[PDB]
Amino acid sequence: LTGTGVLTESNKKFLPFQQFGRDIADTTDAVRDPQTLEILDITPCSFGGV
Amino acid sequence: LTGTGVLTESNKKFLPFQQFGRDIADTTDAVRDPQTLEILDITPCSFGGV
Amino acid sequence: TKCTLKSFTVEKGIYQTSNFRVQPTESIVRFPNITNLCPFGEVFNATRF
Amino acid sequence: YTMSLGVENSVAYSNNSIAIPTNFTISVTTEILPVSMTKTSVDCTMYICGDSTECSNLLLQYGSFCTQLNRALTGIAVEQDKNTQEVFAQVKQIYKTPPIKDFGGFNFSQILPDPSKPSKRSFIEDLLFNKVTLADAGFIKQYGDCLGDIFNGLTVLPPLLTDEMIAQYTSALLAGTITSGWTFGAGAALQIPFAMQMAYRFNGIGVTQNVLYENQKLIANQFNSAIGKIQDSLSSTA
Amino acid sequence: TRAGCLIGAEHVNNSYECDIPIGAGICASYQTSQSIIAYTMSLGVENSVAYSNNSIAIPTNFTISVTTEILPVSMTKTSVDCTMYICG
Amino acid sequence: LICAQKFNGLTVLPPLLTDEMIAQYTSALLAGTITSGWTFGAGA
Amino acid sequence: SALGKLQDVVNQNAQALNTLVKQLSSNFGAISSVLNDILSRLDKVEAEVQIDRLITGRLQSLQTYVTQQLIRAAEIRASANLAATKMSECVLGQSKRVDFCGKGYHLMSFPQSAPHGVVFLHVTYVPAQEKNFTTAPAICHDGKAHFPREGVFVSNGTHWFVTQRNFYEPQIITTDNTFVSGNCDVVIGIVNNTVYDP
Amino acid sequence: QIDRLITGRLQSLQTYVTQQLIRAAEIRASANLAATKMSECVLGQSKRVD
Numbered sequence: 194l195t196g197t198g199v200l201t202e203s204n205k206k207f208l209p210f211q212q213f214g215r216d217i218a219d220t221t222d223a224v225r226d227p228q229t230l231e232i233l234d235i236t237p238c239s240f241g242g243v
Numbered sequence: 244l245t246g247t248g249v250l251t252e253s254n255k256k257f258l259p260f261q262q263f264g265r266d267i268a269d270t271t272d273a274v275r276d277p278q279t280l281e282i283l284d285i286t287p288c289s290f291g292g293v
Numbered sequence: 294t295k296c297t298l299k300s301f302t303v304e305k306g307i308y309q310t311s312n313f314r315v316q317p318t319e320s321i322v323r324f325p326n327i328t329n330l331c332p333f334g335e336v337f338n339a340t341r342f
Numbered sequence: 343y344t345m346s347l348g349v350e351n352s353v354a355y356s357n358n359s360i361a362i363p364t365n366f367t368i369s370v371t372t373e374i375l376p377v378s379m380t381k382t383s384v385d386c387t388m389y390i391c392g393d394s395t396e397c398s399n400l401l402l403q404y405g406s407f408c409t410q411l412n413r414a415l416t417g418i419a420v421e422q423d424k425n426t427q428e429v430f431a432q433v434k435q436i437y438k439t440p441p442i443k444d445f446g447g448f449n450f451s452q453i454l455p456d457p458s459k460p461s462k463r464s465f466i467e468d469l470l471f472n473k474v475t476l477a478d479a480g481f482i483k484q485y486g487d488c489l490g491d492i493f494n495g496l497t498v499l500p501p502l503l504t505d506e507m508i509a510q511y512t513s514a515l516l517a518g519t520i521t522s523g524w525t526f527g528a529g530a531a532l533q534i535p536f537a538m539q540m541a542y543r544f545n546g547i548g549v550t551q552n553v554l555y556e557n558q559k560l561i562a563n564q565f566n567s568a569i570g571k572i573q574d575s576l577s578s579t580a
Numbered sequence: 581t582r583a584g585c586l587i588g589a590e591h592v593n594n595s596y597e598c599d600i601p602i603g604a605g606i607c608a609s610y611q612t613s614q615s616i617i618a619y620t621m622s623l624g625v626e627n628s629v630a631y632s633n634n635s636i637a638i639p640t641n642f643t644i645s646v647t648t649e650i651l652p653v654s655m656t657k658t659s660v661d662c663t664m665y666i667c668g
Numbered sequence: 669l670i671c672a673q674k675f676n677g678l679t680v681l682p683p684l685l686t687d688e689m690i691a692q693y694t695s696a697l698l699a700g701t702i703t704s705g706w707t708f709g710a711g712a
Numbered sequence: 713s714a715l716g717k718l719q720d721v722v723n724q725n726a727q728a729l730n731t732l733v734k735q736l737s738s739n740f741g742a743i744s745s746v747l748n749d750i751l752s753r754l755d756k757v758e759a760e761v762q763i764d765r766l767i768t769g770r771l772q773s774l775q776t777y778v779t780q781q782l783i784r785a786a787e788i789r790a791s792a793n794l795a796a797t798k799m800s801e802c803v804l805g806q807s808k809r810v811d812f813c814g815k816g817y818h819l820m821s822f823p824q825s826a827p828h829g830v831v832f833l834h835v836t837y838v839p840a841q842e843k844n845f846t847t848a849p850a851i852c853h854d855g856k857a858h859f860p861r862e863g864v865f866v867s868n869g870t871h872w873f874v875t876q877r878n879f880y881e882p883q884i885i886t887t888d889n890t891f892v893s894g895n896c897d898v899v900i901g902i903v904n905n906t907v908y909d910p
Numbered sequence: 911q912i913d914r915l916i917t918g919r920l921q922s923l924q925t926y927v928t929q930q931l932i933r934a935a936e937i938r939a940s941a942n943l944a945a946t947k948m949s950e951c952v953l954g955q956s957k958r959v960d
């Protein structure tokens with residue numbers, strides 16, 4: 194599950210089981226580390242114009 | 244390069260060693276003939292709605 | 294501004310020209326903590342199929 | 343049911359008989375009308391593809407369709423601002439309220455701007471901005487703020503003219519109408535105490551001027567009752 | 581600024597009429613030392629209106645005023661042959 | 669410009685009312701504005 | 713730059729013309745933007761699939777083109793029916809419509825013909841040379857309360873005059889300009905002086 | 911696989927701008943109505959019935 198993002202921290206507690214949650218649009222919003230098992234939230238940087 | 248249209252003399256300032264001259268729409272408004280190297284305005288004929 | 298107007302002369306005002314931004318800086322790849330091999334190659338080679 | 347069409351009233355016309363009112367009622371009523379939407383912009387090639395270049399290479403075989411869609415949404419975004427300018431930049435000056443607040447008993451204090459709140463709205467405008475809210479969906483819970491959904495180039499622009507600016511505009515409107523009457527709209531402001539101004543508005547509806555002086559306390563209490571019921575109706579869930 | 585950071589434009593404090601709109605009440609103009617200046621706008625000239633409950637003001641002269649107003653009439657009537665636009 | 673936009677099938681249609689015809693009208697509007705005032709608008 | 717309204721009639725014309733001549737230079741995933749180069753190289757079978765991508769980009773572009781003229785020329789006739797309301801009322805008569813017929817007290821209006829537009833000339837009145845005066849709502853003379861039949865009870869301080877609402881032209885207060893109604897009891901701000909009889 | 915997602919997403923943009931421009935037309939017409947209504951209801955006393 195690849196892409197470009199800014200990976201922030203996570204403190205509000207779902208349930209135990211699966212890897213990813215995803216948004217209304219179906220893209221992922223918050224993703225599992227496969228070793229340490231916490232969640233990095235995917236935010237971007239610099240969307241928009243000049 | 245085929246098509247239809249009328250042939251007139253361009254008698255205008257033309258880029259020296261390609262045969263084609265083009266418009267905004269990248270069609271040949273001017274061609275140079277391969278036999279005698281003279282620049283001919285290929286424009287399409289008189290048309291319109293009725 | 295000249296290219297987004299498609300004009301050599303640019304008039305006075307506000308012009309949204311570039312719609313760009315967004316930038317890669319680094320590369321994280323996280324694979325799991327797995328080091329073992331497995332029988333994925335040795336189920337082709339030999340006799341009893 | 344079949345709809346009841348209205349109250350039947352066969353009014354007794356006669357060829358020499360006629361009806362003339364002996365009293366009246368001063369009534370205020372409320373119209374609500376929209377101006378201009380959310381200023382919104384969308385990037386083409388972040389929305390259609392996350393950071394793919396061959397997206398843009400296949401897109402340029404179609405060409406630059408979404409760039410004229412950027413022309414369309416910036417045409418939308420400039421008509422937001424000129425619709426806002428044509429509904430609020432209709433005056434030239436900023437008119438300022440006097441602190442001495444004699445109006446012939448007409449207590450204006452519900453529709454006066456409030457200096458106690460830092461928001462300088464009126465009380466019914468504070469109730470009105472508390473009524474209509476952005477509590478509808480999770481989209482606008484952080485597209486009301488600046489942190490932003492991730493949505494890929496979809497952006498919300500803030501307007502040029504903000505709420506305290508147009509509150510200062512409508513305070514200047516209410517001040518210029520409340521002191522000059524209508525006479526500021528043609529040019530300079532020409533101040534006038536309320537009795538002649540309202541009495542010529544009775545001449546503007548075509549009755550005389552003396553009935554204001556006869557019934558000025560009654561229309562003062564009728565006005566304060568009338569501005570009571572509309573803030574009760576705003577206080578209701580109408 | 582509330583619409584994000586602007587660069588290359590001089591932040592001043594003084595209020596003027598809005599030449600170039602930016603956003604959130606901030607506007608831009610070209611000051612003559614020539615520089616692009618950025619400013620919160622002026623909403624208009626402040627007129628403290630001197631109310632009296634027993635006195636008025638009355639004009640004694642005039643200025644008749646021709647003002648110019650511009651409204652469009654028609655769009656330019658263009659049409660194509662449809663398949664000739666597709667395929668000559 | 670106009671022959672390049674001609675030769676892709678696109679035409680530009682001329683108006684029925686020319687600008688002289690328009691200037692014939694706006695003169696004749698202004699002529700009754702001076703001489704008849706407004707009375708020609710509601711009748712003769 | 714007040715013709716820049718009418719220049720954007722020409723500009724939003726000529727942008728959309730110069731757009732759609734350049735969308736023939738688009739290829740939509742085919743091998744060529746231009747038509748006959750596909751036809752000179754490939755047999756219909758396999759020239760068919762290139763021109764399948766070509767006309768569907770081309771039909772998409774042209775229906776898009778008309779749709780912005782459909783929103784614009786609706787806005788043009790909305791402006792034109794606005795403008796024809798001025799030529800029915802502001803130009804043809806003298807209207808009471810506040811700043812529909814321009815800013816100020818509207819006198820008459822004049823049309824001037826532009827390309828794709830009419831310039832309107834709202835000739836209006838703006839008053840000037842203002843002066844503070846002391847007003848009264850009513851004057852009672854013999855106990856009975858007099859009110860002006862037109863205009864406003866005005867004072868310079870020395871004398872209680874009457875002039876009209878729009879303009880300083882002071883008149884001696886007669887019976888003929890002022891109607892009597894009631895007695896001076898309910899009126900706040902009553903002024904006790906004479907009323908002239910001619 | 912790419913181009914069908916491209917055409918659906920860009921077609922969502924033309925659908926979105928057609929419903930956005932007709933919202934622009936109607937709230938533009940209400941804004942014109944609001945400007946006229948404030949300019950004659952507020953800044954004067956109109957005689958026009960209701």
Ligand SMILES: *[C@@H]1O[C@H](CO)[C@@H](O)[C@H](O)[C@H]1NC(C)=O
Nearest residue numbers: 226227228229230325326327
């Ligand atoms: C290895 O991965 C498992 C599951 O992904 C996890 O529970 C465990 O803590 C990991 N161990 C280390 C040392 O990271």
Ligand SMILES: *[C@@H]1O[C@H](CO)[C@@H](O)[C@H](O)[C@H]1NC(C)=O
Nearest residue numbers: 275276277278279280281282
């Ligand atoms: C062949 O081409 C040359 C180059 O223009 C020309 O001079 C010559 O006359 C041509 N000969 C014939 C037979 O057409």
Ligand SMILES: *[C@@H]1O[C@H](CO)[C@@H](O)[C@H](O)[C@H]1NC(C)=O
Nearest residue numbers: 334335336337338339340341
């Ligand atoms: C395939 O080869 C490996 C080593 O060469 C051997 O260990 C394995 O048993 C072979 N597979 C089978 C199915 O015999």
Ligand SMILES: *[C@@H]1O[C@H](CO)[C@@H](O)[C@H](O)[C@H]1NC(C)=O
Nearest residue numbers: 354355356357358359360361
């Ligand atoms: C009303 O109608 C009656 C019946 O014809 C008639 O005698 C009378 O004169 C009418 N009055 C008027 C004012 O027309």
Ligand SMILES: *[C@@H]1O[C@H](CO)[C@@H](O)[C@H](O)[C@H]1NC(C)=O
Nearest residue numbers: 590591592593594595619620
């Ligand atoms: C602008 O405002 C700040 C704070 O109000 C003040 O310190 C500064 O001197 C001002 N600058 C000018 C040029 O007025």
Ligand SMILES: *[C@@H]1O[C@H](CO)[C@@H](O)[C@H](O)[C@H]1NC(C)=O
Nearest residue numbers: 444446632633634900901902
């Ligand atoms: C105007 O205000 C003064 C000061 O309060 C007061 O004495 C006077 O009676 C008022 N006049 C009217 C007509 O209200």
